[PDB]
Design a protein around this nucleic acid. Sequence first.
DNA 1: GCGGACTGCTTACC
Length: 893
Amino acid sequence: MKEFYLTVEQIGDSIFERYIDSNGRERTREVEYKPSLFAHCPESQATKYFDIYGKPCTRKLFANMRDASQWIKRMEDIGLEALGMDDFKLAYLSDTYNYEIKYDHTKIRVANFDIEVTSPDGFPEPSQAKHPIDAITHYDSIDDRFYVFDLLNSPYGNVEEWSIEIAAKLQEQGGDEVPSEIIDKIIYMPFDNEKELLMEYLNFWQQKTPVILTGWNVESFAIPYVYNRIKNIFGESTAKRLSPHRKTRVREIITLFGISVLDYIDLYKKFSFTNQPSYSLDYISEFELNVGKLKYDGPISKLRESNHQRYISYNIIAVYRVLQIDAKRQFINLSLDMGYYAKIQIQSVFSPIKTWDAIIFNSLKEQNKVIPQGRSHPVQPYPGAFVKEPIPNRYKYVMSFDLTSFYPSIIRQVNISPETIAGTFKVAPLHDYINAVAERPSDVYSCSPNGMMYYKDRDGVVPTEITKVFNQRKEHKGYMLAAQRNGEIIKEALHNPNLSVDEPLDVDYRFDFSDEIKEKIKKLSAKSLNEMLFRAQRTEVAGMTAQINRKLLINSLYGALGNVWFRYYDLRNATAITTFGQMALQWIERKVNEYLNEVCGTEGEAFVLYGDTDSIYVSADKIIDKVGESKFRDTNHWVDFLDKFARERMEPAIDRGFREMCEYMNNKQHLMFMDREAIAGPPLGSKGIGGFWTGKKRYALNVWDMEGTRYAEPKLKIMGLETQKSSTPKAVQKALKECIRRMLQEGEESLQEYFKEFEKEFRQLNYISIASVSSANNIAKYDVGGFPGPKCPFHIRGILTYNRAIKGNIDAPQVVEGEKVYVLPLREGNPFGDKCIAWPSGTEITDLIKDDVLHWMDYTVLLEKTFIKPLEGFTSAAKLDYEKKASLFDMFD
DNA sequence: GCGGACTGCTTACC
Ligand SMILES: Cc1cn([C@H]2C[C@H](O)[C@@H](COP(=O)(O)OP(=O)(O)OP(=O)(O)O)O2)c(=O)[nH]c1=O
Ligand SMILES: [Ca+2]
Ligand SMILES: [Ca+2]
Ligand SMILES: [Ca+2]
Ligand SMILES: [Cl-]
Ligand code: NA
Ligand code: NA
Ligand code: NA
Ligand code: NA
């Protein structure tokens, strides 16, 4: 097979590389790499090297990497540009792997681990590592085995061996319910001393050295704890065995040279597109996998002592949970894909700037072109997208339209790149271009309304490389949408399931079901169908991960143009994109309004009610009215009608409008592709209002079709409202959403019934479910003798109240700076001495003060502040009442 | 005694 790297590092004048060879074997080599950099040279000098602007350069070979970096400094002292890739390991990878890397993931050692540390005096600080490590579970992807290291003898208690027989038993049998599919994969090792455990773990590590190292919070806890514990016990030289090159670099984070650490919490935060109230593994596992919380009696600091059996079982389970989350989300696969595509260290996938620098560098190197030197720039603001101010109101029938990959398509259309800049023109006010009254900027170059002109013959490296990734994105989105469409087919077949014993069909959910498959589905059992729906949704999530993160990468290339740390930073190019974007949106709003007035036979009516960046929301009341609501059989009938109308009439008109804009700006290629997104409206013959807007970025719609996916049941599309915010209490989100569902689908009366019921019963809701959530930043900034300082935020005040309440209890959970907290208001005269209290999110509040918090919660404040105020906002906007008003009719019986 | 204007903070939407 073709060779591929695993890890690369620079240590002095040496490049240390771990790699898989042509026979599939892992090897390590130290290479005294000789890098090249470039300097501008006279035009009369024969060379094959040119910078991106076409100026000739000469290549300077250096005896070692130190001589190259010293030359860079000297060139700085002279005042001349030192060109070329200054990150020598990226240069090394590019030289060593001068082809498209095809890798075999089964050859890559991915290690998932988690440690346990009993601490009687609070959270065990990794920098101190003063407590024994009493458990390590380490899963190896190559062995497919869970290696379990169990400390039997500790100063905090001597325990019996963990029993795999009991671990496998059901909870109802007094077992631990360790999943049956990993029982035979567990390799259990008890130890009588901590030193012997750690020594063996190091020997194990040497034999099975991770390439990718992951787990939950491994970078901030597990890795530094293990490193510091081993260092404190055996000495630094022994601790350095954690690095395959014996080099490490040190609240601290340890860099293990020759290992690529991908902490799963960081992968999840970057790639999941969620914002969670808590990031405990417990919480995320429940959210992602729908598994129950790992229950136990007493505190964690005594779990090993009281129930060591469960203690070890939960350690193993914790490792497995991350594997299960990755099997669903596939962020490891994404990191490997992106990393090898860019030819970077795998951990550099967290940095889109490093990623794009490497992609562009490799692309330019292929043509013997030389990259410019990074330069220092001051941070400056620059304008972004346009957002229309909507008239707050209900909106019955709505169709939306969105542009495909907007900013990257602008880049490709206008041909925006550092080296395709051609000149400038004199700008007219933006609305002059929008209304097509300003003179055509250029009949030679491709232009943006910010004043920039670009060559339209030349291939730009930014357009070229963004197109390649965009093409990957488009493929994966197709798989995602098909899996989604396949999902609805299965959901509708769950309305008439057969009573028989069969099996789920063997199909590729990435492609639309054939008629044969669909026929078989209608005769399938409920058990088989539910299993198919599961596999369909899993296939959809896999596609979603792949497509939405390639979308993120290409949008981050736009973003990088506005980042001073980017080698190709240029506010001329960044603004060219956003300004063109503002023009395109407002241009097509006009075209859409014009076309719809023409087909509806009216004049001057506003059809576009809202728009943000690249989307428009079209009021379709008059389209429905022209055909008359009476002529429709059911809801699905008018949905098909609007689907057809948008597809056969509106979209061709939109394409005509954009083609004209492309000619207006003399652009290189028409790539403004705006298709229908959502069809929204109330159920036919209902009192539902269909949708409403309260303001910019705040609306709700009752959607029947989304991007070609015809829902089995109508799905609420809610943006910006409190239902969508992690800060809103769980039970309030749920209640507010039901309020919205009733408004959009059923009407005012239905809303009023539900509200009355909620108000009556809400005090019985669990305290966690009605707690607000907030991030805890700068606690110390507002701490004045344990009391709130000037301008102390509400949630920070709650934390200070908590701290005073648990003062003198070394066992009580501490609020961690930067993490999230649950927040509850307190009734007047409470023993806590303040109007609110906060505690670490994702946890029960400590038993020390739990009963008193429950007693003093302010349900009245909770209701009117988190529930009623947002509800008042929704309903006044939609022009209705959540509560029956007083009338002259009240004087009757 | 507190409404309005302004500020910091948080978390959305694109
Ligand atoms: C979501 C997002 C958008 N944007 C900008 C660039 C996007 O092209 C533009 C439009 O937002 P989107 O319409 O949400 O994203 P998109 O048009 O790029 O991709 P899609 O085909 O799924 O619609 O907003 C960012 O800069 N960063 C982001 O994270
Ligand atoms: Ca021993
Ligand atoms: Ca879009
Ligand atoms: Ca059937
Ligand atoms: Cl796409
Ligand atoms: Na742990
Ligand atoms: Na059970
Ligand atoms: Na130490
Ligand atoms: Na779309």
